[PDB]
Amino acid sequence: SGYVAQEKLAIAERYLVPQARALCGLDESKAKLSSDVLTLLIKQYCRESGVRNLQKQVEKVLRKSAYKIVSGEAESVEVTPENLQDFVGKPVFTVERMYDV
Amino acid sequence: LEKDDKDAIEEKFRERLKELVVPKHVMDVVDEELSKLGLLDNHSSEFNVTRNYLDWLTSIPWGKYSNENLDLARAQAVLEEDHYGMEDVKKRILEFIAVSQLRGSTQGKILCFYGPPGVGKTSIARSIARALNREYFRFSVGGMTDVAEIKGHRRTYVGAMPGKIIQCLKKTKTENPLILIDEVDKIGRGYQGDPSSALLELLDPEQNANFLDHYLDVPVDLSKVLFICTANVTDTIPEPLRDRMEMINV
Amino acid sequence: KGHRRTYVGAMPGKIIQCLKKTKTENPLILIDEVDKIGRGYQGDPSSALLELLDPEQNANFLDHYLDVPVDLSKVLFICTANVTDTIPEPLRDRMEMINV
Amino acid sequence: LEKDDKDAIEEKFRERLKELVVPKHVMDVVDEELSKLGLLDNHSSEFNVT
Numbered sequence: 001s002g003y004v005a006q007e008k009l010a011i012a013e014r015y016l017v018p019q020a021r022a023l024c025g026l027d028e029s030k031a032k033l034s035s036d037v038l039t040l041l042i043k044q045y046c047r048e049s050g051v052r053n054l055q056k057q058v059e060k061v062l063r064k065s066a067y068k069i070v071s072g073e074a075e076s077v078e079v080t081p082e083n084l085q086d087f088v089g090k091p092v093f094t095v096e097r098m099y100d101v
Numbered sequence: 102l103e104k105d106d107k108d109a110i111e112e113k114f115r116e117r118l119k120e121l122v123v124p125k126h127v128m129d130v131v132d133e134e135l136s137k138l139g140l141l142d143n144h145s146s147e148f149n150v151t152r153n154y155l156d157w158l159t160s161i162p163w164g165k166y167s168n169e170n171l172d173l174a175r176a177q178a179v180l181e182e183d184h185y186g187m188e189d190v191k192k193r194i195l196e197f198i199a200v201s202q203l204r205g206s207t208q209g210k211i212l213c214f215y216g217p218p219g220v221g222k223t224s225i226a227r228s229i230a231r232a233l234n235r236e237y238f239r240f241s242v243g244g245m246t247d248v249a250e251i252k253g254h255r256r257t258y259v260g261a262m263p264g265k266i267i268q269c270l271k272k273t274k275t276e277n278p279l280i281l282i283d284e285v286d287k288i289g290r291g292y293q294g295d296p297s298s299a300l301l302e303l304l305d306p307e308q309n310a311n312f313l314d315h316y317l318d319v320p321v322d323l324s325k326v327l328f329i330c331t332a333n334v335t336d337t338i339p340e341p342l343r344d345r346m347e348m349i350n351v
Numbered sequence: 352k353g354h355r356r357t358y359v360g361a362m363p364g365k366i367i368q369c370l371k372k373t374k375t376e377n378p379l380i381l382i383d384e385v386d387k388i389g390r391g392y393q394g395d396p397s398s399a400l401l402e403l404l405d406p407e408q409n410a411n412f413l414d415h416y417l418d419v420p421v422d423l424s425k426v427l428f429i430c431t432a433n434v435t436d437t438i439p440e441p442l443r444d445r446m447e448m449i450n451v
Numbered sequence: 452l453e454k455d456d457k458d459a460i461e462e463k464f465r466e467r468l469k470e471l472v473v474p475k476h477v478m479d480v481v482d483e484e485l486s487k488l489g490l491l492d493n494h495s496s497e498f499n500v501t
């Protein structure tokens with residue numbers, strides 16, 4: 001049972017990401033993915049025990065990078081969280097009104 | 102002029118199998134059954150079931166593939182010509198053609214639209230299938246409660262035939278049709294082996310390659326199909342089955 | 352919708368049985384009292400009725416017994432229900448209401 | 452000692468088909484069933500079924 005978000009992040013970057021990357025053929029170089037952007041996707045979207053839904057997310061971003069190479073202009077996408085809003089679209093969860101003091 | 106009437110059919114099954122890329126799971130079982138058929142008399146009571154079983158197994162297409170139009174510039178036209186809006190599905194299709202264009206060989210998927218009735222849910226697949234130009238199909242599953250349509254019977258029964266999906270695949274010679282299940286959420290509860298339990302083994306993206314219909318039990322590859330499913334609301338679906346498939350929201 | 356025809360005694364669904372009796376491709380089928388179809392313990396017929404009642408796709412109606420899609424575009428279905436509330440909305444969409 | 456159990460049973464259907472204007476689709480399925488009849492023995496469970 002279960003998977004804590006930290007462990008899921010570890011598994012993904014070391015197992016899912018290489019796995020889906022070999023399954024989708026994207027070069028390791030061409031579709032860079034920071035741990036930060038992944039952290040955002042974890043904090044805001046996938047908060048549940050299963051691993052599959054995260055697999056769907058990584059595929060979505062990899063897909064969008066593939067089309068942008070296959071027919072866009074850039075020779076590589078470079079996703080930063082400010083860009084993410086269009087790739088994942090509307091965030092589901094709302095970030096907390098993080099008060100300071 | 103009854104020049105070997107029992108052999109011409111055995112030859113026929115040869116010819117139909119020559120061109121095919123027979124899976125290794127099949128090629129032993131087939132020809133050994135053709136031998137067994139060659140032992141027994143044409144009027145032998147088993148012969149007309151065996152002649153059917155081969156007739157199915159020789160006939161269902163094996164690995165023939167339909168290369169699709171690839172340039173997307175022309176895809177836009179046909180994608181727009183018969184419907185307006187539905188932009189997100191257009192983008193997903195752009196993704197699909199892009200990725201399948203990337204690692205050479207074709208690959209399947211599953212998807213699941215949902216939203217208000219009459220949005221066009223049933224109305225797109227004919228457009229999509231026209232886009233890729235892979236053969237279309239449609240298959241409402243509303244209220245179905247008999248797994249046999251997905252499986253067939255044991256061949257001991259008179260007239261048993263492999264599940265309907267295979268009948269489609271026979272009817273569409275390419276090995277990669279766009280199968281289309283429809284209205285999944287209104288699928289019935291048969292109170293004894295209801296279809297959703299069956300469906301999960303089919304729809305699992307990874308296990309589908311080894312679907313094994315009970316009729317002819319040899320596993321079949323089925324990764325190349327791109328299934329699509331529809332439902333007017335996304336609550337009846339069992340939790341894993343909802344996990345299994347993409348949930349586009351028309 | 353009949354049965355697979357591999358069952359011992361299977362015979363085709365109602366409408367086809369209705370149609371063989373009346374040689375027309377355009378009989379006046381008259382469904383009656385739709386509100387009080389059975390529900391809640393077995394496979395609701397309304398789930399199937401959409402296959403019948405689709406205004407355009409009915410032309411490829413598909414019967415378990417005879418698998419072949421059955422064009423019935425010329426038919427003039429009619430349905431009766433004293434109050435058009437028990438009918439689930441998507442089904443109620445297909446067919447124009449009329450109020451005596 | 453039979454009349455309509457192999458060929459004539461086939462034919463009366465064939466002649467019966469003419470006046471109808473069938474879609475070619477089901478006609479091909481019918482032609483398949485017709486060949487399968489001819490292959491089938493005159494007396495069998497499948498025969499009376501089909």
Ligand SMILES: Nc1ncnc2c1ncn2[C@@H]1O[C@H](COP(=O)(O)OP(=O)(O)OP(O)(O)=S)[C@@H](O)[C@H]1O
Pocket residue numbers: 183184185186187217218219220221222223224225333441
């Ligand atoms: N973007 C569109 N452009 C043109 N026609 C459309 C569009 N979207 C929907 N339609 C029309 O929608 C009608 C029916 O489409 P369906 O996809 O059958 O509707 P639906 O959402 O499947 O509703 P159901 O049958 O209750 S599941 C057709 O007559 C189409 O012309």
Ligand SMILES: [Mg+2]
Pocket residue numbers: 219222223224
């Ligand atoms: Mg529809």
